Design an enzyme around this catalytic site. Structure first.
Site, PDB file in Angstrom:
ATOM      1  N   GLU A 141      -4.883  -7.571   1.350  1.00  0.00           N
ATOM      2  CA  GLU A 141      -5.933  -6.801   0.708  1.00  0.00           C
ATOM      3  C   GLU A 141      -7.314  -7.216   1.191  1.00  0.00           C
ATOM      4  OE1 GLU A 141      -3.260  -7.376  -3.354  1.00  0.00           O
ATOM      5  OE2 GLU A 141      -5.340  -6.700  -3.618  1.00  0.00           O
ATOM      6  N   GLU A 250     -11.005   0.955  -8.056  1.00  0.00           N
ATOM      7  CA  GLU A 250     -10.368   0.406  -9.240  1.00  0.00           C
ATOM      8  C   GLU A 250     -11.401  -0.191 -10.131  1.00  0.00           C
ATOM      9  OE1 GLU A 250      -7.618  -2.823  -8.482  1.00  0.00           O
ATOM     10  OE2 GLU A 250      -7.371  -3.288 -10.614  1.00  0.00           O
TER      11      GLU A 250
END
Ligand SMILES: *[C@@H]1O[C@H](CO)[C@@H](O[C@@H]2O[C@H](CO)[C@@H](O)[C@H](O)[C@H]2NC(C)=O)[C@H](O)[C@H]1NC(C)=O
Ligand SMILES: *[C@@H]1O[C@H](CO[C@@H]2O[C@@H](C)[C@@H](O)[C@@H](O)[C@@H]2O)[C@@H](O)[C@H](O)[C@H]1NC(C)=O
Length: 335
Positions: A141, A250
């Site tokens: 990530e 997010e």
């Protein structure tokens, strides 16, 4: 706010004018080498302007060392990382048929989204590269995040993350645990990025993740420059390639409304339909197959993940030389 202790192997500490602290750590004593599975110490030195940071004004790390940002201990809890509850998303997912994708790119527009509850909330935009599922979910990530509880302030900061067991007991942000091996001598992970201006100058975070076919190590490139790699030895499911790539936003809602009734912002804080300069985007939505070909999936090839669409959502903008994903929103006003 307090500073964490210096890590072992620190040869010099540089203090920035804004309070940032950087430890130049011996490249062979960096945290990654304390990983039980990284006993196979052989440091892959190299794969088989935008990276200059303001702290260079006060010093440089000597050759043979890497800059590691000094962790800020705020006294606030840092919640567990979660794959796309009080988390909300505006994400697109590209699901390959098997774990053989050899890399992915993301060019992410940078903003400083506002948080309604800054001591507990976060807002991020990133890429997720993964293989496996549940307890064997492996992730790679990279993106930007506004998380005062973790970083100490409200600026968007570059981050990396990984897990080898679906976030149960492995993985961490940046270089706070053994995992990612940094090879770059001048770029410190975890520093602020320049946010875009609404109706004005736009800034982007270009990241490219590529599996080395000879070693299986996953290299990170920022704006075409090598930063380091996630070693194959810390993983299981993703050692031969990835089966999934996701992109987007997010938020974490510490107020407990499930992200359905908070004005904590995602992206720029404006809905995707506001478009270029006003709504945040992700472009260079590309992945690499086992033959080394760059795949540019069409809009209809992705699955959308937007569980609170009245608060945060996404829209593809087509017709240009490449697909743009506009995403985010202002959230939903508390009732
Ligand atoms: C998009 O991903 C591709 C594939 O990984 C990147 O292209 C590679 O770039 C590296 C250097 O960074 C070269 O060693 C490879 O030969 C390139 N492969 C191909 C097929 O071009 C590309 O740089 C990425 N683009 C962006 C904008 O991130
Ligand atoms: C591995 O997977 C490759 C890609 O899968 C196909 O394309 C992706 C985008 C999905 O839509 C997936 O459902 C499709 O099956 C295949 O082309 C390749 O044949 C697979 N390899 C083997 C050995 O099965």
């Amino acid at each position: 706010a307090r500073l964490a202790n210096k890590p072992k192997g620190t040869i010099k500490t540089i203090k920035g004018d804004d309070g940032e602290v950087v430890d130049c750590v011996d490249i062979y004593k960096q945290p990654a080498f304390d990983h039980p599975l990284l006993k196979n110490h052989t440091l892959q030195m190299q794969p088989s302007n935008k990276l200059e940071q303001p702290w260079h004004k006060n010093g440089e790390c000597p050759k043979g060392s890497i800059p590691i940002r000094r962790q800020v201990i705020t006294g606030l809890p840092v919640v567990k990382k979660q794959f796309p509850t009080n988390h909300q998303y505006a994400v697109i997912a590209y699901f390959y048929g098997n774990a053989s994708l050899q890399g992915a790119n993301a060019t992410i527009n940078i903003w400083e989204p506002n948080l309604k509850n800054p001591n507990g909330d976060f807002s991020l935009t990133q890429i997720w590269i993964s293989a496996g599922s549940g307890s064997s979910l492996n992730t790679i990530e990279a993106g930007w995040q506004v998380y005062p509880g973790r970083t100490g302030d409200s600026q968007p900061r570059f981050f990396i993350y990984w897990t080898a067991d679906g976030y149960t007991s492995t993985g961490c942000y940046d270089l706070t645990c053994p995992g990612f091996v940094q090879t770059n001598n001048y770029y410190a992970i975890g520093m602020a990025l320049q946010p875009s201006v609404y109706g004005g100058q736009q800034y982007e975070l270009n990241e490219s993740i590529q599996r080395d076919p000879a070693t299986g190590n996953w290299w990170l490139y920022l704006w075409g420059t090598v930063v380091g790699y996630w070693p194959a030895s810390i993983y299981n499911s993703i050692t031969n390639g990835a089966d999934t790539v996701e992109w987007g936003g997010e938020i974490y809602d510490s107020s407990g409304t499930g992200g359905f009734h908070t004005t904590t912002q995602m992206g720029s804080g404006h809905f995707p339909t506001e478009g270029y300069g006003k709504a945040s985007y992700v472009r260079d939505l590309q992945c690499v197959d086992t033959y080394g070909n760059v795949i540019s999936p069409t809009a209809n090839s992705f699955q959308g993940i937007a569980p609170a669409p009245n608060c945060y959502n996404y829209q593809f903008q087509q017709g240009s030389s490449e697909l743009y994903l506009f995403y985010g929103g202002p959230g939903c006003q508390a009732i």
